[PDB]
Amino acid sequence: GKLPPGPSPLPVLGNLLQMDRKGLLRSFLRLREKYGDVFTVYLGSRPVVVLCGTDAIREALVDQAEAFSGRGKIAVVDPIFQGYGVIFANGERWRALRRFSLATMRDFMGKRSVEERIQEEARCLVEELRKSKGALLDNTLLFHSITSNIICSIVFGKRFDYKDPVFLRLLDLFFQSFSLISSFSSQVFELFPGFLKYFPGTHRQIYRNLQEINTFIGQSVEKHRATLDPSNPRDFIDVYLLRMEKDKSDPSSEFHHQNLILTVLSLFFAGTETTSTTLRYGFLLMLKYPHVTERVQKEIEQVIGSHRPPALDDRAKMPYTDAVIHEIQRLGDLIPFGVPHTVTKDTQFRGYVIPKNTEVFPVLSSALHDPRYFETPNTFNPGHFLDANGALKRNEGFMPHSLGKRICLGEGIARTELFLFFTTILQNFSIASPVPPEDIDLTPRESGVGNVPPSYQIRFLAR
Ligand code: HEM
């Protein structure tokens, strides 16, 4: 049959000349108004089926879950990952890695739970912020550090002190790669990769930094193997090393060294930046709307008090705080175009045929701003997640972690980090900044990865 409708492309530039300079998101919104919720666009010579609106996204990712469960390539990082690791794998390799990862992170190993690790990280964070004594800070580094430390706890069985210089050198290297992957020069590399990969550019810096991180990950794996107690696995690496030994004879097995290194690197890639940025965005909103922040603090005081630290069971009793977090994620809209998918076979969708391995973009932003589900889509409104009796309510438009078979693997971990970090910080500190609330601008910069909140200063004032 045929592909969904769309603008007429050019030989090598596809529809790039027809794009809007305001961003890809604005262009898709204009293209939606002309062709509907599902359309085809050529970014270079690459055909992409774009899904707009809650319906088209749910029909694809949920109703034909298996058909839309493929993962599309990110060219700037494909030389490192090469289809290994949980985020970039496909087929049987993906199924085995995802099953194993889910179980390991869920049905753990180690001593303490993920929640207990997050509570300990939150306690360390409070002590570090107390030491600041209300000085102006840029919270980017600390929020990168706490989220990295959660992943470290899971994969390496330990956390790092916030001032550990070797931890900070590799962290800087990792987050620089993130800023580079998302730059305009990397966006251009994604459009004309086969050509641009022969000249100097950000792709070389990304590659060098990640090979350095992979070297460190490799050394940790060897060190885990040399100090291994098979009856007491400490973390993800130990559990994976035991599975490698169990599958030693099976040559079909995916449980090898490359999948280990790149699965660990994948967890840092997926599990740090978005969580950190959600926190950064949330604190910016809390500066802009002090009456919301005040109300969260009142709810913390009523349910938790000022003595004990927040625990995950407290969330069920704090619908206002829970609604605020949902609204931070919704308005934050940090992954506006989703993470690219592909169809795993020639697929029939709304009368069209999407050929096998065609790339698909589920535009999560169009669900997060859907006027069917949100009364004031462009305005911060916790009421979007509260019913007339003040209880938390479910919303079909709320999909910041996507849907279907590729749904965010760490959703439960991320949601727990948001709850415990926001409440533990606010239980102990009030916030201020040199910019008056009325002058705070929440407009993001659209980057390669997603929406980047502006940089800002903040004070954490002990209570
Ligand atoms: C607020 C924080 C976060 C948000 C909004 C978020 C969002 C997402 C989204 C939109 C996807 C793409 C799903 C798709 O292909 O349709 C994704 C994938 C994924 N996320 Fe998250 N994520 C966050 C935190 C994390 C955390 C903390 C971890 C790990 C501990 C994590 C692990 C993953 C992995 C491994 C995948 C790939 C899933 C797969 O290909 O099977 N995420 N996430």
XYZ file of C-alpha atoms and ligand atoms in Angstrom:
506
model
C 0.000 0.000 0.000
C 1.236 3.495 0.761
C 2.868 5.545 3.466
C 1.041 8.236 5.477
C 0.646 11.618 3.684
C 3.235 14.379 3.934
C 5.115 17.208 2.196
C 6.911 16.553 -1.073
C 10.611 15.909 -0.507
C 13.792 16.787 -2.322
C 16.368 14.254 -3.458
C 19.000 14.671 -0.773
C 17.507 17.209 1.613
C 14.109 15.545 2.019
C 11.826 18.146 3.581
C 14.534 20.117 5.372
C 14.000 23.288 3.375
C 10.292 23.248 4.301
C 11.133 23.166 8.038
C 10.572 26.006 10.410
C 13.665 27.623 11.961
C 11.813 27.898 15.341
C 12.342 24.174 15.873
C 11.285 20.726 14.799
C 8.343 20.800 17.211
C 6.809 23.892 15.605
C 7.215 22.308 12.140
C 5.432 19.079 13.161
C 2.593 21.178 14.661
C 2.188 23.035 11.314
C 2.508 19.722 9.361
C -0.156 18.169 11.662
C -2.646 20.987 10.816
C -2.221 20.177 7.068
C -1.960 16.340 7.015
C -3.454 15.120 10.285
C -2.062 13.196 13.240
C 0.036 10.759 11.257
C 2.316 11.889 8.466
C 5.602 11.108 6.658
C 8.626 13.461 6.640
C 12.062 13.053 5.061
C 14.944 14.261 7.219
C 17.590 13.993 4.530
C 16.848 10.778 2.613
C 15.502 9.156 5.781
C 11.704 8.571 5.767
C 10.123 9.143 9.239
C 6.470 8.438 10.179
C 5.425 11.048 12.795
C 2.679 10.215 15.356
C 0.875 13.286 16.819
C -1.779 13.306 19.493
C -2.615 10.852 22.226
C -4.763 8.687 19.833
C -2.253 8.058 17.111
C 0.469 7.387 19.731
C -1.705 5.002 21.793
C -2.972 3.225 18.661
C 0.569 2.531 17.545
C 2.499 1.917 20.764
C -0.283 0.194 22.705
C -2.728 -1.345 20.213
C 0.024 -2.644 17.897
C 2.644 -2.898 20.631
C 4.770 -5.609 19.019
C 4.754 -4.009 15.543
C 5.921 -0.601 16.963
C 8.447 -2.084 19.447
C 11.499 -1.433 17.244
C 14.284 1.065 18.169
C 15.626 3.553 15.609
C 19.292 4.561 15.309
C 20.870 7.698 16.819
C 23.804 8.174 14.365
C 26.162 10.244 16.642
C 26.242 7.367 19.200
C 25.778 4.372 16.884
C 29.598 3.944 16.508
C 29.767 3.323 20.300
C 26.621 1.301 20.909
C 26.369 -0.615 17.655
C 22.941 -2.035 18.561
C 24.161 -3.354 21.967
C 22.684 -2.398 25.300
C 19.047 -2.151 26.320
C 18.130 1.210 24.715
C 19.619 0.519 21.290
C 19.092 -3.213 20.881
C 16.400 -4.774 18.746
C 14.868 -8.193 18.389
C 15.849 -11.107 20.588
C 18.868 -9.277 21.985
C 16.533 -6.510 23.256
C 14.015 -9.004 24.749
C 16.676 -10.874 26.644
C 18.432 -7.717 27.896
C 15.170 -6.002 28.900
C 13.877 -9.120 30.742
C 17.138 -9.526 32.578
C 17.408 -5.786 33.422
C 13.842 -5.559 34.676
C 14.231 -8.558 36.923
C 17.640 -7.555 38.240
C 16.647 -3.936 39.043
C 13.268 -5.113 40.339
C 13.650 -8.572 41.881
C 17.041 -7.882 43.417
C 20.892 -7.441 43.725
C 22.476 -6.194 46.886
C 21.349 -5.484 50.363
C 19.218 -2.341 50.385
C 16.379 -1.507 48.050
C 16.403 1.223 45.391
C 14.187 3.313 47.641
C 16.670 2.987 50.527
C 19.516 3.966 48.212
C 17.529 7.070 47.061
C 16.754 7.999 50.681
C 20.451 7.728 51.548
C 21.372 9.820 48.471
C 18.763 12.428 49.588
C 20.302 12.484 53.104
C 23.781 13.046 51.560
C 22.281 15.794 49.354
C 20.744 17.599 52.361
C 24.121 17.561 54.180
C 25.870 18.975 51.083
C 23.247 21.768 50.690
C 23.523 22.634 54.412
C 27.269 23.198 53.892
C 26.439 25.768 51.213
C 24.921 28.050 53.896
C 22.433 29.715 51.570
C 25.038 30.786 48.981
C 23.924 31.227 45.350
C 24.362 27.938 43.439
C 23.832 26.584 39.972
C 22.178 23.190 40.966
C 23.136 21.479 37.617
C 26.238 19.687 38.997
C 24.573 18.458 42.197
C 21.480 17.170 40.331
C 23.756 15.416 37.805
C 25.666 13.909 40.771
C 22.682 12.564 42.739
C 21.102 10.857 39.677
C 24.511 9.436 38.595
C 24.947 8.149 42.156
C 21.665 6.225 41.979
C 22.837 4.478 38.793
C 26.309 3.926 40.409
C 24.620 2.278 43.398
C 22.723 -0.048 41.083
C 25.531 -0.999 38.655
C 28.721 -0.561 40.803
C 27.363 -1.180 44.300
C 28.472 2.199 45.647
C 28.041 5.959 45.501
C 30.706 8.713 45.213
C 31.299 11.768 47.401
C 30.146 14.966 45.636
C 33.701 16.372 45.785
C 35.508 13.186 44.660
C 37.721 14.670 41.848
C 38.057 11.453 39.806
C 34.231 10.902 39.987
C 33.829 14.567 38.843
C 36.323 14.223 35.934
C 34.376 11.270 34.477
C 31.003 12.846 35.293
C 32.092 16.056 33.460
C 33.206 13.896 30.534
C 29.856 12.077 30.521
C 27.673 15.207 30.752
C 29.859 17.068 28.154
C 29.076 14.159 25.755
C 25.386 14.789 26.531
C 25.687 18.539 25.762
C 27.609 17.632 22.551
C 25.126 14.883 21.361
C 22.379 17.538 21.603
C 24.188 20.485 19.928
C 23.172 21.887 16.522
C 26.373 20.378 14.992
C 25.272 16.924 16.226
C 21.742 17.547 14.875
C 23.307 18.178 11.440
C 25.405 15.030 11.790
C 22.163 13.058 12.335
C 20.797 14.387 8.991
C 24.018 13.786 6.877
C 25.983 11.140 8.833
C 27.504 9.051 6.002
C 29.224 12.232 4.690
C 30.100 14.163 7.894
C 31.736 11.190 9.608
C 34.903 11.664 7.488
C 35.629 15.188 8.802
C 36.396 16.644 12.274
C 33.372 17.452 14.416
C 31.431 16.829 17.640
C 30.967 13.148 16.649
C 34.737 12.601 17.289
C 34.580 14.276 20.712
C 31.466 12.217 21.620
C 33.223 9.025 20.519
C 36.438 9.790 22.446
C 34.619 10.693 25.684
C 32.381 7.571 25.600
C 35.312 5.240 24.775
C 36.984 6.721 27.896
C 33.843 6.004 29.979
C 33.656 2.474 28.444
C 37.302 1.906 29.456
C 36.435 2.811 33.064
C 33.292 0.576 32.919
C 35.477 -2.291 31.563
C 37.968 -1.878 34.450
C 35.085 -1.989 36.985
C 33.750 -5.225 35.357
C 37.236 -6.860 35.677
C 37.520 -5.625 39.238
C 33.994 -7.017 40.060
C 34.999 -10.408 38.527
C 38.262 -10.512 40.565
C 36.419 -9.816 43.886
C 33.185 -11.779 43.128
C 31.171 -13.717 45.772
C 28.618 -15.659 43.628
C 26.404 -16.328 46.673
C 26.177 -12.511 47.424
C 26.030 -10.465 44.183
C 26.502 -6.788 44.980
C 24.919 -5.087 42.008
C 23.939 -5.313 38.332
C 27.495 -6.148 37.148
C 27.806 -9.153 39.579
C 24.350 -10.479 38.533
C 25.351 -10.114 34.871
C 28.735 -11.841 35.458
C 26.836 -14.872 36.941
C 24.559 -15.015 33.866
C 27.679 -14.914 31.575
C 29.040 -18.017 33.408
C 25.611 -19.762 33.196
C 25.440 -19.161 29.400
C 29.107 -20.008 28.781
C 28.300 -22.863 26.336
C 25.312 -21.258 24.600
C 26.693 -19.467 21.479
C 23.309 -17.838 20.793
C 23.566 -16.068 24.200
C 23.619 -12.280 24.269
C 25.227 -12.249 27.718
C 28.729 -11.274 26.684
C 31.227 -8.505 27.526
C 30.082 -6.006 24.887
C 26.479 -6.166 26.010
C 27.622 -5.714 29.606
C 29.719 -2.559 29.029
C 27.198 -0.989 26.710
C 24.202 -1.947 28.915
C 25.926 -0.224 31.863
C 26.729 2.831 29.624
C 23.077 2.710 28.404
C 21.723 2.915 31.969
C 23.793 6.067 32.621
C 22.564 7.531 29.284
C 18.885 6.875 29.968
C 18.895 7.206 33.747
C 20.705 10.428 34.561
C 20.114 13.456 32.357
C 16.295 13.430 32.093
C 15.876 12.848 35.820
C 18.359 15.633 36.638
C 16.801 18.067 34.203
C 13.277 17.238 35.520
C 14.579 18.168 38.989
C 16.261 21.315 37.632
C 13.052 22.300 35.834
C 10.932 21.538 38.872
C 13.020 23.799 41.133
C 12.747 26.602 38.530
C 8.940 26.233 38.614
C 9.051 26.198 42.442
C 10.917 29.564 42.329
C 8.368 30.947 39.832
C 5.372 29.793 41.896
C 6.197 30.173 45.606
C 2.570 29.532 46.640
C 2.784 26.038 45.065
C 6.091 25.384 46.885
C 4.522 26.583 50.124
C 1.618 24.226 49.678
C 3.925 21.237 49.077
C 5.812 22.164 52.283
C 2.500 22.279 54.208
C 1.589 18.801 52.906
C 5.069 17.476 53.872
C 4.537 18.967 57.370
C 1.047 17.381 57.754
C 1.939 13.874 56.504
C 5.653 13.442 57.235
C 6.531 16.090 59.782
C 9.952 17.603 60.443
C 11.681 14.709 62.149
C 11.645 11.651 59.925
C 12.785 11.678 56.311
C 10.328 11.197 53.439
C 9.574 7.568 52.442
C 7.868 6.340 49.276
C 4.705 5.210 51.253
C 4.101 8.899 52.095
C 3.305 9.710 48.432
C -0.102 7.948 48.504
C -1.028 10.437 51.320
C 0.263 13.559 49.478
C -1.885 13.997 46.354
C -1.059 17.710 46.024
C 2.738 17.034 45.895
C 2.113 14.052 43.622
C -0.012 16.288 41.271
C 2.747 18.944 41.305
C 5.336 16.337 40.219
C 3.079 15.098 37.397
C 2.612 18.695 36.250
C 6.409 19.355 36.423
C 6.939 16.360 34.092
C 4.078 17.298 31.790
C 4.991 20.983 31.324
C 8.714 20.079 31.411
C 8.114 17.944 28.292
C 11.758 16.905 28.289
C 11.634 14.284 25.500
C 9.261 16.110 23.060
C 9.666 13.800 20.021
C 10.050 10.638 22.074
C 13.043 8.311 21.504
C 12.906 7.008 17.843
C 11.108 3.746 17.118
C 10.921 1.521 14.034
C 8.202 -0.945 12.887
C 9.404 -4.584 13.223
C 7.467 -5.665 10.061
C 5.392 -4.181 7.211
C 2.603 -2.659 9.303
C -0.930 -1.573 8.571
C -1.804 1.639 10.357
C -4.955 3.675 9.631
C -5.087 2.262 6.073
C -1.392 2.991 5.378
C 1.458 0.519 5.094
C 4.588 1.384 7.100
C 7.357 -0.734 5.583
C 9.485 -2.873 7.843
C 12.263 -0.929 9.697
C 10.735 2.459 8.848
C 11.505 4.988 11.618
C 8.661 6.287 13.780
C 8.617 9.350 16.068
C 5.942 9.268 18.826
C 5.603 13.024 19.507
C 5.027 12.738 23.290
C 4.793 16.552 23.488
C 1.495 16.518 21.521
C -0.027 14.179 24.167
C 1.411 16.231 27.088
C -0.199 19.422 25.633
C -3.407 17.705 24.343
C -6.355 20.077 25.023
C -8.661 17.009 25.298
C -6.868 16.040 28.533
C -5.418 19.270 29.913
C -7.601 22.417 30.387
C -4.581 24.865 30.282
C -1.895 22.995 28.324
C 0.682 25.833 28.309
C 0.216 26.837 31.964
C 1.524 25.237 35.145
C -1.573 23.725 36.725
C -1.490 20.981 39.410
C -5.303 20.863 39.110
C -4.741 18.886 35.865
C -4.073 15.819 38.139
C -6.572 16.562 41.016
C -10.292 15.713 41.130
C -13.091 17.706 42.931
C -12.357 15.829 46.213
C -8.609 16.705 46.025
C -7.535 13.113 45.209
C -4.964 12.314 42.509
C -6.552 11.485 39.187
C -5.437 9.597 36.179
C -4.919 11.285 32.845
C -4.581 9.491 29.482
C -2.589 12.438 28.051
C 0.133 11.877 30.672
C 2.864 9.836 28.911
C 6.282 11.521 29.676
C 7.853 8.028 29.933
C 6.168 6.896 26.648
C 3.997 3.693 26.355
C 4.061 0.080 25.105
C 6.831 -2.496 24.956
C 9.590 0.169 24.920
C 8.080 2.150 27.874
C 10.830 3.763 30.031
C 12.557 0.866 31.776
C 13.378 3.022 34.809
C 9.972 4.717 35.256
C 9.505 3.473 38.825
C 13.064 4.483 39.783
C 12.658 7.968 38.207
C 9.293 8.582 39.848
C 10.788 7.560 43.246
C 13.788 9.893 42.742
C 11.431 12.801 41.876
C 9.315 12.217 44.963
C 12.148 11.667 47.459
C 14.481 14.344 46.178
C 11.805 17.066 45.855
C 10.255 16.355 49.272
C 13.503 15.693 51.215
C 14.957 18.965 49.883
C 11.748 20.959 50.614
C 11.320 19.432 54.066
C 14.806 20.827 54.932
C 15.058 23.987 52.830
C 13.066 26.910 51.417
C 14.332 28.396 48.195
C 15.110 31.872 46.853
C 16.823 33.375 43.867
C 17.937 36.888 42.665
C 15.278 36.880 39.887
C 11.771 37.858 41.071
C 9.092 35.207 40.371
C 7.394 37.436 37.775
C 10.689 37.727 35.829
C 11.430 33.971 35.717
C 11.301 32.708 32.113
C 10.394 28.982 31.768
C 11.025 28.833 27.988
C 13.274 25.905 27.068
C 15.862 25.620 24.361
C 15.033 22.785 21.946
C 18.124 20.604 21.619
C 19.015 17.304 19.951
C 17.853 15.242 22.929
C 14.967 17.431 24.176
C 13.921 20.547 26.046
C 16.737 22.182 28.034
C 15.638 24.556 30.858
C 17.612 27.838 31.099
C 20.492 28.020 33.597
C 19.753 29.782 36.867
C 20.871 30.546 40.399
C 19.222 29.391 43.555
C 19.719 29.485 47.317
C 18.719 26.613 49.602
C 17.800 28.237 52.955
C 17.797 25.838 55.907
C 14.495 25.676 57.810
C 12.071 11.784 34.642
C 12.960 10.864 34.214
C 12.810 10.076 32.941
C 11.982 10.194 31.848
C 10.951 11.272 31.568
C 12.271 9.096 30.958
C 11.700 8.961 29.688
C 11.940 7.933 28.789
C 11.369 7.848 27.463
C 10.468 8.891 26.733
C 11.902 6.768 26.902
C 11.702 6.246 25.455
C 10.680 5.042 25.476
C 10.410 4.704 24.037
O 11.235 4.197 23.237
O 9.206 4.959 23.556
C 12.770 6.153 27.882
C 13.451 4.953 27.661
C 14.216 4.280 28.642
N 14.446 4.777 29.898
Fe 13.695 6.430 30.783
N 13.175 8.252 31.501
C 13.543 8.796 32.677
C 14.371 8.203 33.654
C 14.997 6.944 33.476
C 15.673 6.238 34.529
C 15.949 6.841 35.901
C 16.162 5.042 33.985
C 16.990 3.949 34.584
C 17.211 3.764 35.904
C 15.608 5.012 32.634
C 15.848 3.965 31.754
C 15.336 3.907 30.459
C 15.752 2.813 29.486
C 16.813 1.699 29.785
C 15.025 3.035 28.368
C 15.021 2.257 27.054
C 13.751 1.367 27.010
C 13.838 0.297 25.930
O 14.405 0.586 24.828
O 13.353 -0.846 26.110
N 14.833 6.149 32.350
N 12.786 6.842 29.087
